[PDB]
Each structure stands twice: as C-alpha cells, then as structure tokens.
C-alpha cells in the first residue's frame, strides 16, 4: 500500500500557471499510470490526465500530466488559468488490491 | 464512446440492503472493469470496487459489486446499512483508454 500526497488547496490569478503536485510514499511513481481528475462540486469527476500525460478527447491543451522520479511525484500543470478550472483535482494511481486517491487540491483561481 | 448513467438519488432505512446501478449507455457492461468510488462530503474518494467485485483491504464485505448483463449495467450492492455510509458513489470504467466516470449517486440512508 502507499499514499498520495497533495497540498490541501493553492490559489493562482487568471491567465497564470498553476502546477499541482503529487508524491508517492511508498514504491516507485513510474510503477502505475497516475490520473488526473477534476471535479466541480456537486459534479461527477473528469478526467483532464490518464496514463501520465494524455489529455482525453475534449480536454484542452491547456491541462499537461508529468512524471518526476527524482522526486517520487506526479504533476498537474494548468496554463492560462480560466475561472472554470476553479476545482478540486485528484491525483490518482494504482498499488496491488486498490485504486489510492491523493487528498485533493482545492484550486482556487482568485 | 459511451456513458455510465446512475440514478440520481437513492434512500433506503439503516440495517436494509441498498443497491446503485451504473448502466453503460453502448457497449457491453462486461467489456471493462467496473469501479466503484465512495465520496463523503468535502473528502477525497475512495475505492470500495474494482474490478467489477474486488474489496480493497479495510472495506467492509458489507459492500459487494456484480454485473447485470441483462440490463448491462453493473451494480454496488450495501447491505447492513448504516448512516455512515452516507455518501455520493461513482461507478467507473474504461472508453478506449479514457477513464469515465458515471454520473453519480446521492446514498441518503433515511435512519
């Protein structure tokens, strides 16, 4: 088993870039696919990364997955931030008998 | 391409056996492996299902998945219902190599 680590909420004015962080405790991150998933309140995630670094169909470019090993750590980075991103994002990943979720980032785009 | 519909909302008493399907809209249901994901309020989710019935380690047996070919869907079946279980509950799958997810259930146990 292992946890996924993840800074509780971050807060980034409109048309930045915003980097999400997540950090595997325990195991290689390179070991599994690690997700993305945006999530609305009230709505049913979205997924904006799988597999890493791809963007299903729909998603804008504006979303990129990236894969860190020195670190242990998967990222989530949003350019040109629009205030419809404002959401909360999970990474996610798989261990052996479960799928393991991070915390969650609140995004708040001031 | 296909969606994973749920019914909106669900209730039933605490100690009664609740069920929540997950209908994939085209597609065989048994085509993919099923999640189930348990969300309580201002949390992250949880896996209570994968793989159409396997339990994660500390998920109670009281939660149990099956797949209804029939209506194509898959269902989540809680039994010995408490308020705790209260949560919004989404079903999970694969669409080529995309995750989707279905629509989401509210679980109001009335107790």
């Known amino acids: 088993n292992f946890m996924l680590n993840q800074p509780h909420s971050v807060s980034e004015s409109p048309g930045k870039t915003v980097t999400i962080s997540c950090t595997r405790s325990?195991?290689?991150?390179?070991?599994?696919?690690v997700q993305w998933y945006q999530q609305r309140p009230g709505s049913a995630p979205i997924t904006?990364?799988?597999?890493?670094?791809?963007?299903?169909?729909?998603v804008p470019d504006r979303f990129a997955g990236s894969i860190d090993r020195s670190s242990n750590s998967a990222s989530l980075t949003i350019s040109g931030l629009k205030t419809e991103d404002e959401a909360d994002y999970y990474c996610?990943?798989?261990?052996?008998?479960?799928?393991?979720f991070g915390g969650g980032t609140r995004l708040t785009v001031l | 391409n296909f969606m994973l519909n749920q019914p909106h909302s669900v209730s039933e008493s605490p100690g009664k056996t609740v069920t929540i399907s997950c209908?994939?809209?085209?597609?065989?249901?048994?085509?993919?492996?099923?999640?189930?994901y348990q969300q309580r309020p201002g949390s992250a989710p949880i896996t209570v299902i994968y793989?159409?019935?396997?339990?994660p380690s500390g998920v109670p047996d009281r939660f149990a998945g099956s797949i209804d070919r029939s209506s194509n869907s898959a269902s989540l079946t809680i039994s010995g219902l408490k308020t705790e279980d209260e949560a919004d509950?989404?079903?999970?799958?694969?669409?080529?190599?995309?995750?989707?997810?279905?629509?989401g259930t509210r679980l109001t146990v009335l107790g």
């Open positions: 793989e159409d019935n396997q339990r």
């Open positions: 325990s195991g290689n991150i390179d070991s599994n696919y």
């Open positions: 996610q990943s798989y261990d052996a008998r479960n799928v393991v």
